[PDB]
């Protein structure tokens, strides 16, 4: 089956802690970072050192490709990425259009939906 990949966005202090954990390479990151998805498929809880952060699965506007390499010249495409799980420090952990993300991840692709996407003419 096709491997599923998506972007995980954290608050910067938690991103720095998890980044130091990834760069350290210790196994116990599997306890230090967990992801729980609710049955609605859009909300979740990302736990960093048992600290819950309320998370939202949003759809990225631009199609993104993740590619592998060995010699840094010929690249082999591994996956298509179009979704991002965004963790916030506030928000309902169990929540009872708003999942449409408007921006690129990179700096020049800000406001692509409103400024850099030609809109389809109906009829």
């Amino acid at each position: 089956e096709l491997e599923s990949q998506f972007i995980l966005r954290l608050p910067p202090e938690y991103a720095s802690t998890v980044r130091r954990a990834v760069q350290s390479g210790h196994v116990n990151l599997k306890d230090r970072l967990t992801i729980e998805l609710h049955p609605d498929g859009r909300h979740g809880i990302v736990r960093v050192d048992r600290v819950p952060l309320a998370s939202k699965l949003v759809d990225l506007p631009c199609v993104m490709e993740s590619l592998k390499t060995i010699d840094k010249k010929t690249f082999y495409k591994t996956a298509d990425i179009c979704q991002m799980l965004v963790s916030t420090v506030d928000g309902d952990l169990y929540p009872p259009k708003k999942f449409i993300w408007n921006h690129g991840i990179t700096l020049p692709l800000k406001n692509v939906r409103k400024r850099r996407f030609r809109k389809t003419a109906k009829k």
Partner: protein, 401 residues
């Protein structure tokens, strides 16, 4: 010379899907996160997200040891579906600025980076070094606009398309999550490329064209042959039900056409019957099957049926494809416009409605004739150069908006 991975060249599933529904065509290259029915991650609650650092170093060591044991040089490693995973090796992200490109690579296909540089006049000490790609010194520009002296321009290169790429930094909050049935995986990644408008090198067919109808027939012929190679019975045999499950949009009579030359029908007293391979038919070998259908031909067909679904969703029936503005933006119209303009048969609209950015930062691939005639081609070059330089400035800028 592009050498794809072995599951890509072998036309394997699910890397090359056989049929895609209307939902799948709308979700083409945007796969939604879907729940499992079994496995570890089919269970509720939190799940462990495991590190990869020991696994990356071990695989890079082993592949280097396999290189040195036979006994150096260039070695091809993408032989299995397990070798195509994101769990190992050095990785990038590539974010396409186009919402729906005219040609797209599938999982498993290969592409190159060439570092196009134009030499400074007089004593050039050489091109600057980059982390990725191979330096190509060019006197004639491979794009619509011309390089400046001393300008380095990175670009993706394969048999499908040409498109400039721009190295940026991944944000400090963003990580790559690899999700399988068995667990969640995480890797650090810093290098992300912004990819501009494509310069297509392979022609996208039109709906129900002769080239498109030949491709569907040949891909059916490839899939039938590999079913015989998968069969372990002697003599080899397959079922009609297995082909219809992979090809629900084909009638059985169209499948009866492809099976009459190579197989003989043996009826059995059950609603499940076999096509037994003819004893005097030599089943074609693997590389002969490879020559029948290439990975590039599938992507051209995949681009057509996805865009045809988008036009039907927009209210355009089959009689529309004197031509509407959105129908001009179809990949069978843009690529035929560009390649003929690449071959010198015509010129391009460049300022026009088929601009994918919608704000003047891209090219409109619509044919205008070559028809005071040195000013006509100079104004084409001036309009090409302006937007090319503008696209270089915007997509490489680190300005925070």
């Amino acid at each position: 010379i592009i050498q794809h991975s072995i599951p890509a060249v072998e036309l394997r599933q699910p890397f090359f899907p056989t049929h895609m529904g209307p939902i799948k065509l709308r979700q083409f290259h945007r796969p939604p996160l879907k729940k499992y029915s079994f496995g570890a991650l089919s269970q509720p609650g939190p799940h462990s997200v495991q590190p990869l650092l020991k696994h990356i170093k071990k695989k890079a060591k082993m592949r280097e040891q396999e290189r040195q044991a036979s006994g150096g040089g260039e070695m091809f490693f993408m032989r299995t579906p397990q070798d195509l995973t994101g769990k190992d090796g050095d990785l990038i992200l590539a974010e396409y600025s186009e919402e729906n490109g005219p040609l797209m690579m599938q999982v498993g296909m290969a592409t190159k980076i060439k570092n196009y540089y134009k030499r400074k006049p007089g004593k050039d000490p050489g091109a600057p070094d980059c982390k990725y790609g191979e330096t190509v010194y060019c006197h004639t520009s491979p794009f619509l606009g011309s390089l400046h002296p001393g300008q380095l321009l990175q670009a993706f290169e394969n048999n499908l398309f040409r498109a400039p790429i721009y190295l940026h930094k991944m944000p400090e909050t963003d990580f790559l999550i690899i999700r399988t049935r068995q667990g969640y995986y995480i890797r650090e990644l810093v290098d992300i490329f912004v990819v501009g408008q494509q310069c297509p090198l392979f022609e996208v067919p039109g709906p129900n064209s002769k080239r498109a109808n030949t491709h569907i027939r040949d891909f059916l012929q490839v899939f039938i042959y590999r079913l015989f190679w998968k069969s372990k019975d002697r003599p080899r045999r397959i079922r009609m039900e297995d082909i219809k499950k992979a090809f629900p949009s084909h009638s059985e009579s169209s499948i009866r056409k492809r099976l009459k030359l190579c197989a003989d029908f043996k009826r059995t007293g059950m609603d499940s019957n076999w096509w037994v391979l003819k004893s005097d038919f030599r089943l074609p070998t693997e590389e002969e099957i490879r020559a029948m259908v290439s990975p590039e031909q599938c992507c051209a067909y995949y681009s057509m049926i996805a865009a045809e679904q988008r036009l039907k969703d927009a209210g355009y029936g089959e009689k529309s494809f004197k031509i509407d503005d959105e129908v001009r933006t179809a990949p069978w119209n843009t690529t035929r416009a560009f390649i003929a303009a690449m071959k010198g048969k015509c010129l391009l609209e460049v300022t026009g409605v088929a601009d994918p950015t919608g704000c003047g930062e891209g090219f409109s691939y619509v044919k205008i004739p070559n028809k005071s005639v040195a000013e006509h081609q100079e104004r084409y070059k001036e309009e090409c150069q302006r937007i090319f330089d503008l696209q270089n400035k915007v997509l490489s800028s680190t300005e925070v908006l």
